[PDB]
Amino acid sequence: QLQSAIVKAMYAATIESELDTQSAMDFILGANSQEQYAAAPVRLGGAKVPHLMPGDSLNLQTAQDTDNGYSVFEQSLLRYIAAGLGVSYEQLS
Amino acid sequence: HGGGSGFGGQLRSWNPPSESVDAALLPNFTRGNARADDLVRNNGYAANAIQLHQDHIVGSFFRLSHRPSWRYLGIGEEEARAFSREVEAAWKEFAEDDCCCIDVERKRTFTMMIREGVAMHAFNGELFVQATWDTSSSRLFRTQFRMVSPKRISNPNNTGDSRNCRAGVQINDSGAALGYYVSEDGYPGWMPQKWTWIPRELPGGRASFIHVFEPVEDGQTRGANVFYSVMEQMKMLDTLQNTQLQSAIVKAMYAATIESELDTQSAMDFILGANSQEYAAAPVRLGGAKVPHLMPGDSLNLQTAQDTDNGYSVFEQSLLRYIAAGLGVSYEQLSRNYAQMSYSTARASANESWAYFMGRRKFVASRQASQMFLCWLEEAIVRRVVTLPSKARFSFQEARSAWGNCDWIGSGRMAIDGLKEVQEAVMLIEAGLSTYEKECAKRGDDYQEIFAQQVRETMERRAAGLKPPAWAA
Amino acid sequence: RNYAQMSYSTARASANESWAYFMGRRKFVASRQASQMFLCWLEEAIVRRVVTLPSKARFSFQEARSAWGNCDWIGSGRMAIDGLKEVQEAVMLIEAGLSTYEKECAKRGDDYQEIFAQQVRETMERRAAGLKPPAWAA
Amino acid sequence: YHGGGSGFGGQLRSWNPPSESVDAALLPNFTRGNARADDLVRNNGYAANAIQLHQDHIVGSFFRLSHRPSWRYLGIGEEEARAF
Amino acid sequence: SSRLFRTQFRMVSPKRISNPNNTGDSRNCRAGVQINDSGAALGYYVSEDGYPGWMPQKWTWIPRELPGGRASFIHVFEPVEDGQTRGANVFYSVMEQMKMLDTLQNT
Amino acid sequence: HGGGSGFGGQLRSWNPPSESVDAALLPNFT
Amino acid sequence: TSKETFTHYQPQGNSDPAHTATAPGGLSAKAPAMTPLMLDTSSRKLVAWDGTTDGAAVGILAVAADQTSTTLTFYKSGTFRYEDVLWPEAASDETKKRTAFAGTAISIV
Amino acid sequence: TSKETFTHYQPQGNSDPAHTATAPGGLSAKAPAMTPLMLDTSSRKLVAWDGTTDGAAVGILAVAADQTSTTLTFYKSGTFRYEDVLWPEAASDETKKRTAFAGTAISIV
Amino acid sequence: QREGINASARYPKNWVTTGDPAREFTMIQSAPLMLLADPDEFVSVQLA
Amino acid sequence: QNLADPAYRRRRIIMQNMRDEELAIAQVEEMQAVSAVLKGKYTMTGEAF
Amino acid sequence: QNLADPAYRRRRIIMQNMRDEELAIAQVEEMQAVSAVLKGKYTMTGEAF
């Protein structure tokens, strides 16, 4: 569950441009103006609404709930293990 | 059966390589300590937990109570208690000395050293203290102490572990510690890290080196930090929170999209306003609300984004409770999420946490403090600054435990209410099932000087001739 | 500054733990630095002779700096959450004899000798004016 | 042990912190860390709030001294100790 | 001598105390602190106030104590392990988390 | 350790200007 | 109206360090910065890399100089991309331009 | 009476690192360190640089030796001063000496 | 000499090359001059 | 049957390497000692030296 | 007769180098200032610059 949450949160947005990767990056995100593959890292400024052209899109995947019943299911299993172990569930958890 | 194979296979491939605790821990002992140090130095929760340990196990002060076994030694109570008062006064005037020279490092006091030891034993699993004789005789007591990081005890010349030499620890056949190997500092990491061998117990009866830890199985030469049960979970928690924050940053930072067929500069000028009259692109001003016009083909659509905390808070709740359970500290103490809590529930949780803390206090801080106290007491009696009773059936070196028998007083249990607990305390003392020393020790002081100061207070009050206090006649 | 969804017991617990941490840090930082500054000024005062030493001192200040200069410090105390309950606890403590004026005035951020002297003066002036004896007389 | 060895399913196979004293682990960029903390407290509301809380609760408005000399160690009378 | 007391105080920022000329760090010399073999602090190389940063800053050596035992300089911190000279700021564990939080506020 | 660079570069560029409070204030004091 | 595309300058393209050296120069024209050079056949002076004498490339100029410059400073090592360095028009083949500095501490990416 | 100057021996002229390597040696006679070297046109052996042949200079000897040394250790990288190097008397043009080590990681300053 | 270890028995040293290739090296330095005051004290013979 | 991580291999190999270097130092010390008190005409020779 | 350690010797030479470096930089700005307020127009030109 930790791994799935990590990956689903980490992949936040995506680009659907017909052009090359670096052109898409420096015309949708920005960055460039480097010092010296790894593509290019974009500095975290503010807003910077981009402009698009037909055949190009930016999609921000909404992901989903990181704890869609996982907490309550784990709580039930914790009650189970507490009963098995003979100690109070509240003290255990 | 449950441990055999697993229902429908399940754990058919998992079978831990059963070996001793030393075999489990030692191969990656250094790496585990390094990872624990990284977590504690770069994680907020780990720092909070170690701070909680520091404040609860010993608190801000530590008072000695030396109760020698007069009955065991055949010593009269009067001289026993007089000697106890003398040694208590000497120890209290020596430990908190502003000289700060209780340690040769000259940067810590007695309580600070006890807290350092508690902390490094908590996040490493063990504590090492060395007692030395300063050559300078200007001080009445020339005995000082030095804390040692567990990583400083290691096999000289990177030699492999043997039957008797395990990680720079030479032990007898019975497994008792005999000698230790220590290294000087390695900063910067370019000069030799030489080695020095120190006997744990000097033949004179004094303890040159003391290594205190809580073993979990026989033959365990080095303690293991409690972090081992939560390493990966807390690291994953930190990574998840960080990447979630970054993703929220990105999703919020991208808000609107504009698409057009003509030039980007002109499109932004004619849609977002921009400052074309003046790749810098075209930053725009932030004035009043504005509405643009667009011909077909162009479109400006804002992005609905996505809820930045879709259950991440609940996942954090569960992970934090797991980490707290692994650490042995209460969830509310660790996370400071004191919401949805009732009086009875909070009281019970604080009570169990306090019981665990008191157990750890007795098993670590009290023991090391008593050891340090007896080490100092040996020099004290040798220099005869204090005198044992002449009728001493046994000598000090014979009955070190008996002569140096002592307990300790730390920070008291601060009640959530206080009113109920102190009504309980006064009802206890009036019912007679408890006593003044017990309750004063619980609160964080000693009835002896409490009564002495009460006498001082009533004497001052009667001298001033205003009102006797509620203890007279 | 988000004091929402807080009940009395949880507020008490959070305040108690935070205050314990603060008092510990005070003792371990401010007390140390204040003691060092105070002893550095005290030695200057003692060599300037503006203060008087006991004649039969077994040891001199140079070797007994910690002994002569031993002191404690009191900052602003734990401010009350309710007040009425705290003063009830204090008065029942002093009635039960389980506490002392020094440490209760300490936790209230006061000095026992100072308050005693002020009470003496107030009682004296009240008697002189013939208004009413305070609740400490004879 | 087992968790600190390599991690579940590899996972933390690249996490290999170097084992050194905090002096070796901090002094290289000690000034840089102090600069980061200083700028953070100077130009963040929350850090300034925390610092203000520390300042106002660690000591408070006043700070009184109570000199309690070791009169028992010095072998001096209580009245002389109190006068001193 | 206009005052009865000759003692006066002056704060020293941690930046004001450092290795002279930003040189390396030896066993006895670490970040402008000269210590003995056992690690006890002996002397300090305090840089003068280099404001504005144009005039060449100079370092001055000061013993921790005078020969008479007077503590001319006082260094107070909470060490975390043996052989530690300079303390660690409390914020050091949460710097980047709080920084990213501020960036999130702005964005 | 965390003061160096952070997670995956992260604050790879944040290098605040260690300086006096006067250097922080006076240049933009007015 | 008046807009520009701003980018930083990238002398390097990798983590290989670049080192410099100074040698007497015999340039006859204004040679701009980042220009390849070669040795003189007779006087063993330094001249701009013509692009025709194959295999005689020695280094790349660091700071633009002129005829009056007795000595010139040139990178004796490092990596450079294709477009950052200008080339003489005599060298007209991409392969020749790419491999002119082969066998020396100068590399082209 | 006798005046003796204490001077620091600093062969390197720049911070650029200097590297050492070993190769078969065919020294004709005694030769101290900081000596230009060359490859025999036929036997591919290392010998003292003539001082006249162009481009023959390759490396700088690192340790004194003689004909008995089958293998010689020499510098292949770094920068050194004109005076710090003992050159063969055949070399007589200052520009030639300066540009002799052109095209290799050994440079003069 | 940076740490004033000019006189020492041994000297382990550790570092890693920078740049694109990152490889670690381990070093040891010393200079023994095993000596004896009086050679005449010992007598060496080759049996035959 | 029980693999080890590359970093564990690193620590093992570096410990072995430092042991080997220490053994080499012991070798050269012993060789110098035996040459010295075996002939008194103790050479000190080697390439790159 | 009173010989010091080579480590302290290195410290001494490092201090001497620092002082020489400081004098060298100071004289540069001194020349800048004298050129500036003696003729106004002021050009800077160095080898490899």
UniProtKB/Swiss-Prot annotation, chain B:
<comment type="similarity">
    <text>Belongs to the siphoviridae portal protein family.</text>
</comment>
<keyword id="KW-0946">Virion</keyword>
<keyword id="KW-1243">Viral long flexible tail ejection system</keyword>
<dbReference type="GO" id="GO:0046798">
    <property type="term" value="C:viral portal complex"/>
</dbReference>
<dbReference type="Pfam" id="PF05136">
    <property type="entry name" value="Phage_portal_2"/>
</dbReference>
<keyword id="KW-0238">DNA-binding</keyword>
<dbReference type="GO" id="GO:0099001">
    <property type="term" value="P:symbiont genome ejection through host cell envelope, long flexible tail mechanism"/>
</dbReference>
<dbReference type="GO" id="GO:0003677">
    <property type="term" value="F:DNA binding"/>
</dbReference>
<keyword id="KW-0231">Viral genome packaging</keyword>
<keyword id="KW-1162">Viral penetration into host cytoplasm</keyword>
<comment type="function">
    <text>Forms the portal vertex of the capsid. This portal plays critical roles in head assembly, genome packaging, neck/tail attachment, and genome ejection. The portal protein multimerizes as a single ring-shaped homododecamer arranged around a central channel. Binds to the terminase subunits to form the packaging machine.</text>
</comment>
<protein>
    <recommendedName>
        <fullName>Portal protein B</fullName>
    </recommendedName>
</protein>
Curated annotation (Swiss-Prot), chain D:
<comment type="subunit">
    <text>Homododecamer. Interacts with the terminase complex composed of two small and one large terminase subunits.</text>
</comment>
<comment type="function">
    <text>Forms the portal vertex of the capsid. This portal plays critical roles in head assembly, genome packaging, neck/tail attachment, and genome ejection. The portal protein multimerizes as a single ring-shaped homododecamer arranged around a central channel. Binds to the terminase subunits to form the packaging machine.</text>
</comment>
<comment type="similarity">
    <text>Belongs to the siphoviridae portal protein family.</text>
</comment>
<protein>
    <recommendedName>
        <fullName>Portal protein B</fullName>
    </recommendedName>
</protein>
Curated annotation (Swiss-Prot), chains G, H:
<comment type="function">
    <text>Stabilizes the expansion of the capsid head shell after genome packaging. The packaging of viral genome in the procapsid triggers a dramatic reconfiguration of the capsid shell, expanding from roughly 50nm to 60nm while the capsid thickness decreases. 415 capsid decoration protein molecules cooperatively bind the expanded capsid, thereby stabilizing the mature capsid shell.</text>
</comment>
<dbReference type="Pfam" id="PF02924">
    <property type="entry name" value="HDPD"/>
</dbReference>
<dbReference type="GO" id="GO:0098021">
    <property type="term" value="C:viral capsid, decoration"/>
</dbReference>
<keyword id="KW-0118">Viral capsid assembly</keyword>
<dbReference type="InterPro" id="IPR004195">
    <property type="entry name" value="Head_decoration_D"/>
</dbReference>
<keyword id="KW-0426">Late protein</keyword>
<keyword id="KW-1232">Capsid decoration protein</keyword>
<protein>
    <recommendedName>
        <fullName>Capsid decoration protein</fullName>
    </recommendedName>
</protein>
<feature type="compositionally biased region" description="Polar residues">
    <location>
        <begin position="1"/>
        <end position="17"/>
    </location>
</feature>
<keyword id="KW-0167">Capsid protein</keyword>
<dbReference type="GO" id="GO:0030430">
    <property type="term" value="C:host cell cytoplasm"/>
</dbReference>
<keyword id="KW-1188">Viral release from host cell</keyword>
UniProtKB/Swiss-Prot annotation, chains J, K:
<comment type="subunit">
    <text>Homomultimer. Interacts with FI protein.</text>
</comment>
<comment type="similarity">
    <text>Belongs to the lambda phage major capsid protein family.</text>
</comment>
<comment type="function">
    <text>Assembles to form an icosahedral capsid with a T=7 symmetry. The icosahedral capsid is about 60 nm in diameter and composed of 415 major capsid proteins. The assembly is primed by the interaction between capsid assembly protease and portal dodecamer, and major capsid proteins assemble cooperatively to form the procapsid with the help of capsid scaffolding protein. Major capsid protein forms hexons and pentons of the icosahedron. Viral genomic DNA is packaged into the procapsid through the portal vertex.</text>
</comment>
<protein>
    <recommendedName>
        <fullName>Major capsid protein</fullName>
    </recommendedName>
</protein>
